[PDB]
Amino acid sequence: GDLAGKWQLRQYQYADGTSEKVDSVFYNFQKGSFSAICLLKDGGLTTFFGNYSLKGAEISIILLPESVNDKNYDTYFGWPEGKCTFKVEDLSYSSLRLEYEGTKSIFRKF
Incomplete structure (x- = not known):
């Protein structure tokens, strides 16, 4: 469907009203498999791996212990x-909007 593929995380909209552009994080959804590519300042590429499941208008993402133990996890x-x-909050073929405790993660299909 629309969720399948790679997504560039463009912006965070924080619960306190602050917004910040993001240009280094990419989420990928493929039939339950989750992965996030993060571009480090040092030109490096760090990838986190996990799974995701859907229930109504909610998405639960769970990362593997190895990704949780990654030096860049926090x-x-x-x-x-x-x-x-x-x-x-929003899903179309080109747009994705995720919300957790008032903070929004804004994505565009990549």
């Missing part, structure tokens, strides 16, 4: 137990 995720359930 830079890009920092989720307790490598898990986060997001509200899908």
Whole structure:
């Protein structure tokens, strides 16, 4: 469907009203498999791996222990137990909007 493929995380809209552009994070969804490519300042490419499941308008992402133990885990995720359930505020073939505790993750299809 629309969720399948790669997504560039363009912006965070924080619960306190702050917005910040992101240009280094890419989420990928492929039939339950989740992966996130993060582009480091040093020209490096760090990838986190996990799974995702859907229930109504919610998406639960769970990262593998190895991704949770990654030295850059708190830079890009920092989720307790490598898990986060997001509200899908918007999904179309080109747009994705995820919400968790007032913070929005804004994506465009890549």
